[PDB]
Each structure stands twice: as structure tokens, then as C-alpha cells.
């Protein structure tokens, strides 16, 4: 009670609590994004582009989860890459509940290619199944998804050479970059079961340095504004 | 995937050579251990507040 | 016949106190409801509780007895508490509107520089405006007509004080709230507006539903504020200037006087008893 | 090849031997034991300070100090007697889903989505906690870790293997392989010669620390196992799974004894622990409730309601005075 040791213990507890509160306030000022996608789906390219101008604002190599810390327009972003996590997603996907948005990356040029596990499995079909699984989890019901369609030029060359009917037999239209890209985009967007709660922002990755991060910033600001409107009761 | 089959069958044949006892004896041993230390379990029998560290000093 | 009036007033104070106290308790005992918006809503609930505990009983006694039987000093205390607490309730409404406007129109400020110190500053400014409106009639600047009739507790009817108090307590807040909520409405509409045919039809229907909801909610807020407080301030701005030829009917005058206090009862319903988080917290407490 | 035929033959032989060794169920033996009765526990301490979901906790051997891990990248050493934060260790990676307290009370460990088990030195010359060593080598998320001694630590990860580490050197002394799914839980025997691990392949295995081989295999569940804990005797253990069913397995009998299930619960178990005498089996559930089970009767004796989101971790002191449950609402609660 009044002993010196008890006073010292209470003082240390109060100091630690103040430090914890300060760290929590500092961490609450950060926007968290989850990066997903197939293996060779252009994930690293998007990470490099986002960190080209802004990076980080005897440790052992982790390779489990990779954090990218970049700031744009006075807004702090954190991206978590779980590509190297080879295990069941069901056991740790709930750790990312509460992220502002999910950055899903899929390559347009792998529709012709097939997985190495078996020949009769399209890579784009694997990406679609992953998108369906991650867009309808019980944890990400309120979380918006930012969809990036990488490798537009390779896809254009491939559809110039090879037709799109192999990946989508039901498809019936002219083989052109615009129409095929629109078809792929709408096919990915039709997997969103929670139409009323979440929204999908689709962008085609471009060689310009700042356009992709600008699109991400616009999507995050739109998500924040719509969440505020919902809290206020006007949305 | 045939090399792992040999390891699996070796593990199975190794797991089947252990001595086993009757379930009645094991249940009796568990019950005896439970009843022997029942007096020393503060959770089973609520402790008086005089010597309860988490309520009163 | 006075028994009916007494029981109606008593149940009015009882409901107001119960609602405001429930809102304050729910905010206090829940960790989930501890953000800036709920802090402002809780301060508004506390102000309404002060109106219902410190002002409504004396006003109800005045209504029932149809005369003031408590004293001149008690009359001054009642007037000061009445002007201070009710002006505060209005400026809490304006502060909530301002916070919503800042959150909706400035996401960067919402993420970075939005801290509970902002809520504390807004509450302090509201109470400071309340004091600036309530104090000066006490420190002079009051006509002797207030003390001329001992069997009455009317607010000072000086033209300058009437203009000052009415403007700074209802009319400046009204314009501020109208401008802020108009900007908020424009922002909401801009956000909403911005087989393939089935998806397009579904999106159009969803946009129409959201537009109807963002019209209804804004209408509820603004209409409640207007229909609660506007008639009394129109009366208080018109009658003092026109001393004669503007007799006020007793029943209509009493209804106009007592309409303003219903805002302190309807405020928790609109700002607290509607959002989902408060309902979940109340269900958990129940 | 044709080895599947002899494999299934050996499986049938093992099942036949287990059925032959089973004569009377545990329910029949303990029919004459009087019921434990209703167990009423009231919250005694509420430990506050975490700002995110809590995934693990562990009690010290002195039964006064406990450690908790949460998503805010903090590892807090509490003082359960006075609710005083003794330490607050900032983690390099905020994705942590396990923690352990050394038996000597000198070290504390944690691990998570990053595949590294970090060892923190508590008692140092300057009084400031510093990273003693980082243990790398797993290829999946680290699910559990237990200090076998002041120098040896055993870890279980999501790469379907468990490993024994030497903290002084930092290399894997022994690797335990054989699981066909992610290993989610681990518990050490009181004599620290064997340990059991429950994995996502709906099976639990008994390992020998020195030999590094799977001694026995237990398969009763229908879904992945999220928790495990030895009986205080050291000859039995209890597992919790997403099937919403806790089971008691016996090492000597090499089979299943009791099933703890109720029709009103359909949510999986996240944590399992025993009382000091072994009569009470406490389990945490996904419906933010904790149920106290009669280990010898399979009848509920109480409910430790009071949490909000989900009870994720649970533990019982060595002296048995108190039970601490941590949940996703960022609160530790001491029950007693
Ligand atoms: C002619 C054409 C068109 C016009 C005709 C018809 C249509 C319109 C008519 C006019 C409208 C009248 C009132 C409608 C109210 C109504 O619909 O209420 C909805 C249903 O809630 C309940 O049922 C829950 C109710 C709980 C009530 C409180 C319980 C306690 C009361 C006593 C308290 C004191 C004693 C304890 C809830 O609200 P809502 O759907 O109206 O919409 C919003 C609300 O307006 C926003 O304020 C709120 O934001 P907040 O400011 O943070 O709260 C939003 O979250 C959202 O709820
Ligand atoms: C203190 C006394 C006055 C009791 C409180 C009454 C209020 C709760 C009333 C007064 C005016 C009403 C509003 C008058 C008109 C409308 C528009 C109405 O809009 C529609 O759905 C269709 C018409 C349109 O497009 O405006 C929705 C209800 C609302 C906001 C009403 C909600 C309830 C209000 C705020
Ligand atoms: C927000 C919802 C719940 C509606 C709120 C309604 C109130 C504004 C009502 C409820 C009881 C009403 C009172 C009930 C009875 C009387 C007495 C009545 O007596 C008179 O002086 C009339 C003339 C006479 O008979 O001499 C004057 C109105 C008044 C104060 C009423 C004023 C308006 C009150 C406060
Ligand atoms: N002007 C102004 C002005 C300016 C700026 C302001 N800010 C805040 C206010 C306060 C607004 C409400 C004032 N109260 C007093 C009048 N009312 C009342 C109640 C019972 C009654 O009973 C009798 C009877 N029995 O005769 C008569 C009578 C009258 C109830 C409402 C204000 C006012």
C-alpha cells in the first residue's frame, strides 16, 4: 500500500501505460492494406512501384510476412505481403480483420498459361477462385477490394496472337484489348456477392510512376469518406 | 512419392509394437489420482478469503 | 384539471432524464463507444440531462401553479440556468454538425489530426457561448420591469438584449447548421452518384435508395431542430419590439414555451438511439 | 506402389488391438463418483492496457506474473496480484500468435506470422528488456512454443513440423516430422521427456524429445485441432478442435476415453487447460464463453461468461489458485 516498493511499482505501471497509450495513438494514424494474389501475378512489381519514391516512411530475414511502409499526400500506408506464407489461410486470415482495404493483384497475361501442379488448371481460374474465396470471407464483409490488372502489354500481344476462348469458352466477341480487358474486369467484379456493403475499384497497371499510387490513395480516401457517411447515417 | 511410403509403413509397424494396458486399469488410475489430490485443488473447493491472494492480502 | 398537467409534465421530465442518463451511462461503461463523435453525443446528452434536472422541474412548477412562488433570487437563478443550459444544447447540435462536416469533407484530417482534444475544445466553446449569453443580464443591463411584478419570472425584454440573445443563441447556430449540412448533403450526393444490364439496374436502384436515405436523415435532423426551437425564438424576436397589438393566447403561448424542451428529449433518440453501435451496446447492457 | 495395402492392414491391426484393449468405458467406471456440483467463479482482476486482439498468454512458475501477446506488437508482463505492468516489450513484428514464459522466470518468447521465434531476456544488468536471440528456420507461421528448460525451447509451426532448438547456438537440434497438416498446438509433459502436438490433420501425436520420433498417433477428431494440454498425472491429455468437441486421450491405453460435447455449442474450441487436481477441464470457445467440464463425468459444471469477442487463450496457475482467460476484446481476466 504505502510501502516504497509498491509506490515504485505503481509509478512504473503508470509510465508503461502512458507509453502504451502514446504508441497506440501513433499507430492509429496509419492506413493498413493487405496485398494478395497468385505467385507470379505482378505483386512484387506493384510493391516496388509504390515504394519507388517513399520507403520505410542483426535482424534475420523473415520471408514470412513483408511490410512495406510508404507515405503519399501526407497519408501513412502499410502494406502486408503474405505471398511467402505457405500454409492454410483459414488459420491466420482473421489476423488481418480491420484493414482499410485489400490490394488484390492478378496478371492478365496468364490466362493462356497453366499451373505447374496440373495441366488442366488455368492460372486465371486459380486467381478467380482465390478472389472469390477472399472477397466473401466472414471477416472481410465490410472491407473494400482494390483490384490491379497487371501486364496489359503482354496481354495485348497474347490476344493478338492467341484467342481468349481457351480461358473463357462462353466468351463470344471480337479479339481486341479494350473488349477483352472489359470482359476480364466484369468477370472479376461479378464474384462480389456483398454488393451493398463492399465495392471493388479496378485499375489497369500503367508504366507511369505515380498513377497507381494515386489510384490507391483515391480509393482509400473514398473508402474513408464512405465509412464516415455510413457512420453519420447518410449512406 | 514412393520413398515416403516406406517411411510411413515403418512408422506404422513401429507404432503397433508398444505394450497396451486395459482401459479399466487406466480409468481407475485417473480416478485415483483425481480423488487423491482433491483436497489440494483450490478451484474445486473454494478457498476461504483469508488465504485467497486474488481477493484479500 | 391541474392534475393532468402535472402528471404529463412529470412523465415528460421522467422520460427525458431516463433517456439522457441511459445514453451517458452507455457511453461511460463501454470501451467501444469512446471516440470523438460519441464524446460529442455524450456531452450533448449530459447537457440535456442538466436541462431536465435543473430547469424542467422549476418550469413545471411554474406551469402548474400558474405563478412564481420561489423568490426573486430563485427567479434569477432559474433564468440564468434556463438561458445557459438551453443555449448550450443548441451549440452542441452545431458542434456535432461541424464535426461531421470535417470528417466527411476532410479524410486526411480525419486520419491524422482528429483527437479527443478537438471534442474537448468544441464542448468548452459551446459552454463558453452559453455563459456569454446567460451572464450579462445578471451583471446589469436588465430593465427593472423584470422585478416590477413579483408574481412572474419573465426574461428581460430589453430590445438590445433581445436581439443579442436571440441571434447568438438560435439564429447564428441556425445559419451555421444549414450551411454545414448543405455542404454535407452535396458531398454525400457527389459520393453516391459517382448480365451488365441487371448489374446496372441494381446499381441504379441502390443509388436511389441511398439518395432517399440521405434525404430522410437530413430531413429528420433539421426538421426536429426547426419544429422544436423556431417558434419560440420567432415569438421572442417579434413580441418585444411590438409591445402593443400583439397579445399572445394563453394556450398557444404555453405550447410555444414548452415546445423547446422537447428537443432535450428527442436529441438522444436521433443522435444516440438510432446508430447501430449504440443499439448493440444497449442490448449488451440490457 | 503396393505399400498402401500393408499400410491399411497395419491400420486395421492397430484398430483391432485398440478395440480389444477397450473393455469398459470411463463413464461406467466413474458412475459411482458423486458430482462435483455447480462451480461459480467471479472475475477478480481485469488486466487492461492491450489495444488489439490477444492470441496467447502464459503463467509464470511463481503463479504471480503472466505474459500476454497481442496484435499491437506488445508483450506485456503483468502482475496479477496488483494488476501492475512489470514490463512492456515492443515486438519487431506485430503479427504474434504465441508466447511462453520460461520456468526459471528469466526469459520470455514469442512468435507469429513471421517464421522467427524471438527470445527476450528479462533479467539483465540494466533492467531493460533486449532481444537475446532470434530463432529462424521454420517455413510457416509459428503456432506455439514452450520453454523445455532455460536453454532448450521446443516450437511448433505451420509447416507441418515441430522443432527442438538450442538457444545458446541457435540451430535446430532435432526436427519432428510426420504431421500431414499445420501444427496448431503443443504441450510438454510435467517430466519434460515427451510432448504432444495437435495439428490440422485431425490427429495428435506423442513425441520423444531425445529420440525425435513419433511414439504414438491419436486420431479421434473430425476437424483441425487448435489446443492440447497434458493431464497433471502425465499419462493423459485433452484436445480441443473446431468440431466443437473436447476429447480425453490416454497414453497407456493408446485410445480415446471421454468426449466432452453439448448440443447447444457449435463453435470450435480455441484453448484447453486442466485444473491442479485434474478434475476440472476448462475450455475456451468461439462464442466468447468458457465452459468448465467435469473431467471424469463429461458434465458442465460452470460457465465463465464475461468476455466480448472470443476467448483465444487460457491458463491455470501451477498452484491452482486462479484461471486467466484472454480474449479478442483486449482484456485479461483473472477468475479464481
Ligand atoms: C409521405 C412520404 C414519406 C414520409 C412517410 C414515411 C416515412 C418517414 C416518416 C418520418 C420518420 C419518422 C421516424 C423514423 C425513424 C427510423 O426509421 O428510425 C430507424 C429505425 O430505428 C428504430 O426503429 C429504432 C427506434 C428506437 C427508438 C428509441 C427508443 C427509446 C425511446 C424513448 C427514449 C426515452 C426513454 C428511455 C433508425 O434510423 P434511420 O433508419 O432513420 O436512419 C439513420 C438515422 O436517421 C440517423 O440519425 C442515424 O445516425 P446517428 O445520428 O448516428 O444516430 C443512422 O445511423 C440511421 O439510423
Ligand atoms: C417537436 C415536435 C415537432 C415533434 C417532432 C417531429 C419531427 C420528428 C418531425 C417534424 C418534421 C418531420 C420530417 C418532415 C418530412 C420528412 C421528409 C420525408 O421524405 C420522404 O421520405 C419523402 C418526401 C421528401 O422527398 O422530402 C421523410 C421524413 C421527414 C424527414 C420527417 C421526419 C420527422 C420530422 C423531422
Ligand atoms: C417530443 C414528444 C414526446 C412531444 C412533446 C410534447 C410536449 C411539448 C407537451 C407534453 C405535455 C404538454 C403540456 C401539457 C399541458 C399544458 C397546460 C396548458 O394549460 C394552459 O395554460 C392552457 C390555457 C388554460 O387552460 O388556462 C398549456 C400547455 C401545457 C403546458 C402543455 C405544453 C406542451 C407539453 C409540454
Ligand atoms: N428571449 C429569449 C431567449 C434568448 C436566448 C435563449 N437561450 C436559451 C433560452 C431559453 C429558452 C426557454 C425559456 N423557457 C422559459 C419560458 N417557458 C415557460 C415555462 C413555464 C411557464 O409557466 C408560465 C406560467 N405559468 O405563466 C410561463 C412559462 C414559460 C419555458 C422556456 C433563451 C431565451
XYZ file of N, CA and C in Angstrom, chain D residues 33-179:
441
model
N -18.982 -42.041 -8.628
C -18.414 -40.815 -8.082
C -19.492 -39.741 -8.032
N -19.611 -39.077 -6.887
C -20.606 -38.026 -6.753
C -20.238 -36.820 -7.619
N -21.226 -36.073 -8.112
C -20.920 -34.933 -8.984
C -20.127 -33.862 -8.255
N -19.313 -33.134 -9.023
C -18.534 -32.038 -8.456
C -19.454 -30.912 -8.003
N -20.601 -30.766 -8.656
C -21.547 -29.718 -8.336
C -21.295 -28.455 -9.141
N -22.217 -27.507 -8.988
C -22.106 -26.241 -9.699
C -20.860 -25.489 -9.251
N -20.105 -24.984 -10.220
C -18.893 -24.215 -9.965
C -19.175 -22.769 -10.344
N -19.072 -21.872 -9.369
C -19.366 -20.457 -9.561
C -18.075 -19.672 -9.364
N -17.600 -19.037 -10.432
C -16.386 -18.232 -10.402
C -16.738 -16.792 -10.732
N -16.132 -15.857 -10.009
C -16.357 -14.433 -10.208
C -15.045 -13.770 -10.597
N -15.106 -12.866 -11.571
C -13.919 -12.143 -12.001
C -13.310 -11.379 -10.834
N -12.008 -11.560 -10.633
C -11.293 -10.921 -9.536
C -10.395 -9.782 -9.984
N -9.749 -9.912 -11.139
C -8.905 -8.859 -11.685
C -9.196 -8.721 -13.169
N -9.194 -7.489 -13.662
C -9.329 -7.207 -15.085
C -8.085 -6.449 -15.525
N -7.255 -7.094 -16.338
C -5.989 -6.518 -16.773
C -6.226 -5.744 -18.064
N -6.001 -4.434 -18.016
C -6.259 -3.539 -19.131
C -4.958 -2.920 -19.623
N -4.928 -2.580 -20.907
C -3.747 -1.979 -21.493
C -3.460 -2.423 -22.912
N -3.926 -3.610 -23.284
C -3.786 -4.058 -24.662
C -4.785 -3.328 -25.550
N -4.358 -3.002 -26.770
C -5.166 -2.218 -27.695
C -5.592 -3.014 -28.924
N -5.465 -4.336 -28.885
C -5.841 -5.176 -30.012
C -6.144 -6.578 -29.497
N -6.435 -7.488 -30.421
C -6.820 -8.843 -30.055
C -5.646 -9.589 -29.432
N -5.936 -10.405 -28.427
C -4.924 -11.198 -27.737
C -5.013 -12.644 -28.204
N -3.874 -13.209 -28.612
C -3.822 -14.590 -29.074
C -3.132 -15.572 -28.140
N -2.409 -15.119 -27.122
C -1.733 -16.084 -26.268
C -1.454 -15.478 -24.902
N -1.263 -16.362 -23.927
C -0.804 -15.977 -22.602
C -0.130 -17.179 -21.958
N 0.639 -16.909 -20.907
C 1.301 -17.971 -20.164
C 1.562 -17.495 -18.746
N 1.481 -18.420 -17.796
C 1.685 -18.125 -16.387
C 3.120 -18.444 -15.997
N 3.675 -17.643 -15.095
C 4.968 -17.965 -14.534
C 4.883 -19.104 -13.537
N 6.044 -19.690 -13.236
C 6.077 -20.773 -12.259
C 5.752 -20.278 -10.858
N 6.005 -19.000 -10.579
C 5.626 -18.424 -9.296
C 4.136 -18.128 -9.199
N 3.393 -18.272 -10.298
C 1.944 -18.086 -10.330
C 1.528 -16.683 -9.901
N 2.350 -15.681 -10.204
C 2.003 -14.298 -9.907
C 2.160 -13.436 -11.152
N 3.158 -13.746 -11.973
C 3.465 -12.989 -13.178
C 3.005 -13.772 -14.398
N 2.328 -13.092 -15.319
C 1.896 -13.699 -16.568
C 2.231 -12.777 -17.730
N 2.385 -13.374 -18.908
C 2.737 -12.665 -20.132
C 1.599 -12.830 -21.127
N 1.311 -11.772 -21.880
C 0.298 -11.805 -22.922
C 0.853 -11.190 -24.198
N 0.369 -11.682 -25.334
C 0.775 -11.193 -26.643
C -0.448 -10.726 -27.414
N -0.314 -9.594 -28.100
C -1.425 -9.014 -28.835
C -0.915 -8.401 -30.130
N -1.859 -8.049 -31.003
C -1.548 -7.588 -32.350
C -0.939 -6.194 -32.399
N -0.939 -5.450 -31.297
C -0.320 -4.132 -31.290
C 1.194 -4.196 -31.149
N 1.789 -5.370 -31.324
C 3.229 -5.512 -31.217
C 3.760 -5.270 -29.824
N 3.024 -5.698 -28.803
C 3.420 -5.506 -27.417
C 3.349 -6.830 -26.677
N 4.326 -7.058 -25.808
C 4.414 -8.260 -24.983
C 4.525 -7.794 -23.536
N 3.402 -7.778 -22.826
C 3.311 -7.163 -21.507
C 3.471 -8.232 -20.437
N 4.303 -7.950 -19.439
C 4.454 -8.796 -18.262
C 3.604 -8.196 -17.153
N 2.513 -8.864 -16.801
C 1.603 -8.360 -15.785
C 1.993 -8.878 -14.408
N 1.411 -8.258 -13.390
C 1.481 -8.724 -12.008
C 0.037 -8.946 -11.573
N -0.412 -10.200 -11.652
C -1.830 -10.495 -11.475
C -2.330 -10.122 -10.086
N -1.444 -10.101 -9.088
C -1.868 -9.748 -7.737
C -2.338 -8.300 -7.662
N -1.610 -7.383 -8.302
C -1.883 -5.955 -8.189
C -2.180 -5.288 -9.527
N -2.293 -6.058 -10.609
C -2.587 -5.535 -11.946
C -1.587 -4.454 -12.355
N -0.315 -4.703 -12.061
C 0.766 -3.780 -12.378
C 1.545 -4.304 -13.575
N 1.730 -3.455 -14.581
C 2.523 -3.835 -15.742
C 4.007 -3.792 -15.407
N 4.618 -4.958 -15.213
C 6.038 -5.001 -14.884
C 6.887 -4.609 -16.087
N 6.544 -5.107 -17.273
C 7.316 -4.849 -18.480
C 6.370 -4.650 -19.655
N 6.896 -4.040 -20.714
C 6.166 -3.875 -21.972
C 7.196 -3.938 -23.095
N 7.260 -5.078 -23.769
C 8.286 -5.353 -24.771
C 7.704 -5.044 -26.145
N 8.270 -4.099 -26.898
C 7.786 -3.833 -28.262
C 8.375 -4.837 -29.242
N 7.503 -5.567 -29.930
C 7.945 -6.602 -30.852
C 8.361 -6.001 -32.186
N 9.332 -6.645 -32.839
C 9.730 -6.215 -34.175
C 8.618 -6.461 -35.184
N 7.919 -7.585 -35.060
C 6.781 -7.908 -35.908
C 5.522 -7.950 -35.056
N 4.513 -7.174 -35.451
C 3.289 -7.085 -34.668
C 2.372 -8.285 -34.859
N 2.671 -9.168 -35.809
C 1.851 -10.352 -36.057
C 2.378 -11.482 -35.184
N 1.847 -11.570 -33.969
C 2.277 -12.548 -32.977
C 1.068 -13.373 -32.565
N 1.250 -14.693 -32.483
C 0.164 -15.586 -32.099
C 0.616 -16.658 -31.114
N 1.706 -16.422 -30.389
C 2.120 -17.329 -29.331
C 3.050 -16.593 -28.383
N 3.139 -17.099 -27.158
C 4.093 -16.590 -26.184
C 4.302 -17.652 -25.118
N 5.451 -17.576 -24.455
C 5.794 -18.537 -23.422
C 6.611 -17.840 -22.349
N 6.557 -18.388 -21.141
C 7.293 -17.862 -20.002
C 8.235 -18.950 -19.510
N 9.511 -18.614 -19.375
C 10.498 -19.618 -19.007
C 10.238 -20.119 -17.590
N 10.492 -21.401 -17.311
C 10.285 -21.900 -15.943
C 11.128 -21.179 -14.909
N 12.345 -20.773 -15.271
C 13.184 -20.026 -14.343
C 12.712 -18.591 -14.168
N 11.814 -18.116 -15.026
C 11.335 -16.755 -14.942
C 12.268 -15.714 -15.512
N 13.349 -16.127 -16.170
C 14.331 -15.187 -16.694
C 14.068 -14.791 -18.138
N 13.411 -15.644 -18.918
C 13.225 -15.410 -20.340
C 11.746 -15.428 -20.700
N 11.443 -14.868 -21.866
C 10.100 -14.884 -22.431
C 10.238 -14.950 -23.945
N 9.349 -15.701 -24.591
C 9.437 -15.941 -26.022
C 8.125 -15.576 -26.698
N 8.203 -15.330 -28.004
C 7.020 -15.052 -28.801
C 7.317 -15.361 -30.260
N 6.251 -15.562 -31.028
C 6.361 -15.829 -32.449
C 5.009 -15.660 -33.099
N 5.015 -15.606 -34.427
C 3.776 -15.364 -35.137
C 3.828 -15.618 -36.626
N 3.223 -14.719 -37.406
C 3.194 -14.868 -38.853
C 4.582 -14.845 -39.470
N 5.484 -14.009 -38.968
C 6.892 -14.157 -39.297
C 7.390 -15.462 -38.696
N 8.284 -16.137 -39.413
C 8.650 -17.509 -39.086
C 9.766 -17.589 -38.054
N 9.906 -16.570 -37.211
C 11.027 -16.442 -36.290
C 10.502 -16.505 -34.863
N 11.142 -17.329 -34.036
C 10.864 -17.381 -32.604
C 11.858 -16.472 -31.892
N 11.355 -15.422 -31.254
C 12.201 -14.445 -30.585
C 12.300 -14.771 -29.101
N 13.516 -14.725 -28.566
C 13.772 -14.967 -27.151
C 14.192 -13.647 -26.523
N 13.437 -13.196 -25.527
C 13.687 -11.928 -24.854
C 14.247 -12.190 -23.466
N 15.319 -11.485 -23.118
C 15.973 -11.641 -21.823
C 15.393 -10.613 -20.859
N 14.708 -11.088 -19.818
C 14.043 -10.182 -18.888
C 15.013 -9.632 -17.851
N 15.697 -10.515 -17.130
C 16.599 -10.108 -16.058
C 17.970 -9.814 -16.652
N 18.294 -8.531 -16.778
C 19.569 -8.078 -17.313
C 20.178 -7.070 -16.345
N 21.407 -6.643 -16.645
C 22.120 -5.744 -15.746
C 21.561 -4.328 -15.761
N 20.973 -3.890 -16.874
C 20.445 -2.539 -16.983
C 18.950 -2.448 -16.714
N 18.266 -3.573 -16.533
C 16.841 -3.556 -16.276
C 15.972 -3.298 -17.485
N 16.542 -3.296 -18.686
C 15.801 -3.046 -19.914
C 15.796 -4.310 -20.761
N 14.611 -4.709 -21.221
C 14.465 -5.961 -21.952
C 15.066 -5.819 -23.343
N 15.905 -6.780 -23.723
C 16.552 -6.789 -25.026
C 16.435 -8.174 -25.645
N 16.463 -8.217 -26.976
C 16.306 -9.471 -27.708
C 17.552 -10.318 -27.481
N 17.390 -11.459 -26.808
C 18.532 -12.332 -26.562
C 18.964 -13.054 -27.832
N 18.010 -13.601 -28.584
C 18.323 -14.313 -29.815
C 17.039 -14.537 -30.599
N 17.169 -14.558 -31.922
C 16.066 -14.846 -32.828
C 16.303 -16.204 -33.471
N 15.310 -17.082 -33.385
C 15.416 -18.459 -33.859
C 14.677 -18.572 -35.187
N 15.427 -18.772 -36.265
C 14.869 -18.894 -37.602
C 15.141 -20.284 -38.161
N 14.328 -20.684 -39.134
C 14.472 -21.990 -39.744
C 13.161 -22.640 -40.131
N 12.058 -22.192 -39.539
C 10.753 -22.662 -39.974
C 10.356 -21.988 -41.285
N 9.483 -22.659 -42.031
C 8.953 -22.115 -43.272
C 7.476 -21.768 -43.183
N 6.871 -21.858 -41.995
C 5.491 -21.485 -41.795
C 5.330 -20.682 -40.513
N 4.117 -20.173 -40.313
C 3.836 -19.353 -39.143
C 4.040 -20.162 -37.871
N 4.644 -19.532 -36.869
C 4.911 -20.207 -35.606
C 3.646 -20.217 -34.756
N 3.176 -21.410 -34.394
C 1.891 -21.533 -33.717
C 2.020 -21.630 -32.203
N 3.044 -22.314 -31.700
C 3.207 -22.453 -30.259
C 4.674 -22.682 -29.938
N 5.034 -22.388 -28.692
C 6.393 -22.586 -28.212
C 6.350 -22.758 -26.703
N 7.172 -23.670 -26.192
C 7.246 -23.944 -24.767
C 8.701 -24.088 -24.354
N 9.076 -23.414 -23.271
C 10.435 -23.498 -22.743
C 10.609 -24.834 -22.040
N 11.323 -25.754 -22.687
C 11.638 -27.022 -22.042
C 12.607 -26.811 -20.887
N 13.495 -25.831 -21.015
C 14.473 -25.509 -19.985
C 14.915 -24.068 -20.202
N 15.916 -23.642 -19.433
C 16.455 -22.299 -19.601
C 17.267 -22.162 -20.881
N 17.639 -23.275 -21.510
C 18.459 -23.252 -22.714
C 17.828 -23.945 -23.912
N 16.844 -24.817 -23.717
C 16.197 -25.537 -24.805
C 14.748 -25.092 -24.916
N 14.292 -24.869 -26.144
C 12.915 -24.486 -26.422
C 12.400 -25.335 -27.575
N 11.156 -25.790 -27.462
C 10.504 -26.585 -28.495
C 9.401 -25.743 -29.119
N 9.350 -25.728 -30.448
C 8.417 -24.890 -31.185
C 7.651 -25.728 -32.193
N 6.432 -25.290 -32.493
C 5.582 -25.919 -33.492
C 5.082 -24.849 -34.446
N 5.220 -25.097 -35.741
C 4.893 -24.110 -36.757
C 3.876 -24.679 -37.737
N 3.464 -23.839 -38.680
C 2.504 -24.207 -39.695
C 3.065 -24.970 -40.868
N 4.362 -25.262 -40.863
C 4.985 -26.052 -41.915
C 4.918 -27.550 -41.647
N 3.977 -27.988 -40.810
C 3.709 -29.392 -40.505
C 4.850 -30.075 -39.761
N 5.748 -29.316 -39.134
C 6.834 -29.894 -38.356
C 6.977 -29.160 -37.032
N 7.500 -29.873 -36.040
C 7.889 -29.304 -34.760
C 9.394 -29.461 -34.607
N 10.032 -28.508 -33.935
C 11.480 -28.497 -33.823
C 11.909 -28.242 -32.386
N 13.076 -28.774 -32.037
C 13.722 -28.522 -30.758
C 14.948 -27.653 -30.995
N 15.011 -26.516 -30.311
C 16.053 -25.529 -30.537
C 17.035 -25.502 -29.376
N 18.262 -25.094 -29.675
C 19.289 -24.839 -28.674
C 19.554 -23.339 -28.675
N 19.111 -22.657 -27.619
C 19.134 -21.196 -27.610
C 20.566 -20.678 -27.644
N 21.489 -21.381 -26.987
C 22.876 -20.928 -26.969
C 23.472 -20.903 -28.372
N 23.197 -21.932 -29.173
C 23.717 -22.000 -30.531
C 22.782 -21.371 -31.555
N 21.480 -21.616 -31.442
C 20.527 -21.092 -32.397
C 20.169 -22.027 -33.528
N 20.608 -23.278 -33.476
C 20.340 -24.253 -34.521
C 19.315 -25.279 -34.049
N 18.637 -25.891 -35.016
C 17.639 -26.922 -34.737
C 18.359 -28.193 -34.307
N 18.315 -28.494 -33.008
C 18.920 -29.727 -32.518
C 18.196 -30.952 -33.065
N 16.866 -30.917 -33.085
C 16.072 -32.040 -33.560
C 14.820 -31.505 -34.236
N 14.402 -32.180 -35.303
C 13.205 -31.817 -36.049
C 12.235 -32.988 -36.037
N 10.986 -32.716 -35.666
C 9.946 -33.735 -35.580
C 9.051 -33.623 -36.808
N 9.080 -34.647 -37.656
C 8.288 -34.685 -38.874
C 7.309 -35.847 -38.821
N 6.247 -35.737 -39.612
C 5.248 -36.784 -39.676
C 3.833 -36.265 -39.801
N 3.592 -35.048 -39.323
C 2.273 -34.448 -39.448
C 1.977 -34.117 -40.904
